[PDB]
């Protein structure tokens, strides 16, 4: 089992500094290079930096926009890489993932799952969640309800439904940045004979400010 | 830098048929040791990229077999033998010969099918929101086909534009079709000095606007 996990991302301040961890198992890692590549609206997938194994003498390169303000360095004995991130600016804001180069020759072979950086100095607030349940009677043969996570900074937040029990029937929509605030839609449509009768909750997690709200969908 | 080149910003597949996507270096991507490092990756909506091919045209573990790749120098082309509903997502080359490392800008693989009227559902503030001072109406325009569609608010008639939030899913991976989200944003008070809401809703399949709305006094 290969795995790649990203971890220290998150909200941080313009001109601070901001450290990334990327913990490796299931692969040669003495025998790979590992590099970090982030995403970002403005230029799709952009290579930052990497670093070379022991026998390569553990050698550095950087894209040139980063150059001298991120540190790229590895812990072998940890089997893990790190992007320790300077002078932070807005451009440096995007998802940042951590892919492994086994030198048997394969490319980027293997990528962690990405850790969200959001460069900015506005302050992290949990958001409101609120049900939305339909105004009339349901007939017909399915109903579809939601629940609006609104007023929360920075992203991401998750969204479940019966904690997961209901997921075939979901769409949880991208979050719309408004006045330094996110606001986000996720609707459930099941069949008629499910809800109001059983009872649909949906679970809303913001892990910046460690908030955890379970609302339930009642009739109107 | 060397520039990775993905003319097809999308292209329109039907499930079954055979497609292959391009891309084009603006340098030859041949090594002094004679490898091709040209490779091509897929990122499926909201997860992380993966690898497909490397170098050219080798299938990456647990890549389907409906995958191959071709190309040389400054041209290459990733094919499907038959695209699968599943394949949606956007699918990226890059050069992995000299630094720094380079994508192309990518094309993403959009799933063909018959026409599907969205199901229009509007809710009013709910009760919990209202007591804080606030009145978002929502409107959910869910499981549409073609991914084009308009949607206008009307306040007592009158229609708004300021305060209205969008957003829209990617193509579903199950049944290729698309949803979207519209919030009307109001403070209680403005939401208080009208009585009738409506999510308005143009699409390829109907003549006439999709009509859904509801009325604050009641």
């Known amino acids: 089992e290969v795995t790649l996990q990203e971890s220290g991302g998150g909200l941080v301040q313009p001109g601070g500094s901001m450290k990334l961890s990327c913990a490796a198992s299931?692969?040669?890692?003495?025998?790979?290079?590992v590099d970090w590549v982030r995403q970002s609206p403005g230029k799709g997938l952009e290579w930052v930096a990497e670093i070379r194994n022991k026998a390569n003498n553990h050698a550095t390169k950087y894209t040139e926009s980063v150059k001298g303000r991120f540190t790229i360095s590895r812990d072998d004995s940890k089997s893990s890489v790190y992007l320790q991130m300077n002078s932070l600016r807005a451009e440096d804001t995007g998802i940042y993932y951590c892919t492994s180069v086994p030198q048997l020759g394969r490319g980027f072979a293997y990528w962690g799952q990405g850790t969200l950086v959001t460069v900015s100095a506005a302050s992290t607030t949990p958001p409101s969640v609120y049900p939305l349940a339909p105004g009339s009677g349901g007939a017909g043969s399915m109903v579809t309800l939601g629940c609006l996570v609104k007023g929360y900074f920075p992203e991401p937040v998750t969204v479940t439904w019966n904690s997961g029990a209901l997921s075939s029937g979901v769409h949880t929509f991208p979050a719309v940045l408004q006045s330094d605030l996110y606001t986000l839609s996720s609707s459930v449509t099941v069949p008629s004979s499910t809800w109001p009768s059983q009872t649909v909750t949906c679970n809303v997690a913001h892990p910046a400010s460690s908030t955890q709200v379970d609302k339930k969908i009642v009739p109107k | 830098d060397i520039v990775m080149t993905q003319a097809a910003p999308s292209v329109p597949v039907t499930p079954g048929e055979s497609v292959s996507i391009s891309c084009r270096s603006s340098?030859?991507?041949?090594?002094?040791?004679?490898?091709?490092?040209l490779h091509w990756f897929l990122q499926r909506p909201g997860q992380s990229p993966q690898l497909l091919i490397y170098r050219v045209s080798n299938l990456a573990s647990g890549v389907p077999d409906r995958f191959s790749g071709s190309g040389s120098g400054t041209a290459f082309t990733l094919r499907f033998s038959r695209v699968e509903a599943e394949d949606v997502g956007v699918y990226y080359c890059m050069q992995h010969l000299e630094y720094p490392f380079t994508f192309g800008s990518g094309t993403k693989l959009e799933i063909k099918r018959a026409d599907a009227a969205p199901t229009v559902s509007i809710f009013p503030p709910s009760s919990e929101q209202l007591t804080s001072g606030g009145a978002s109406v929502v409107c959910f325009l869910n499981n549409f086909y073609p991914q084009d569609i308009t949607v206008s608010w009307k306040i007592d008639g009158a229609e708004r534009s300021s305060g209205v939030l969008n957003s829209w899913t990617d193509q579903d991976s199950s049944d290729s079709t698309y949803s979207m989200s519209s919030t009307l944003t109001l403070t209680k008070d403005e939401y208080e000095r009208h009585s009738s809401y409506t999510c308005e809703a143009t699409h390829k399949t109907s003549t006439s606007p999709i009509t859904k709305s509801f009325n604050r006094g009641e």
């Open positions: 299931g692969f040669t890692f003495s025998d790979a290079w």
């Open positions: 340098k030859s991507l041949l090594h002094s040791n004679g490898y091709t490092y």
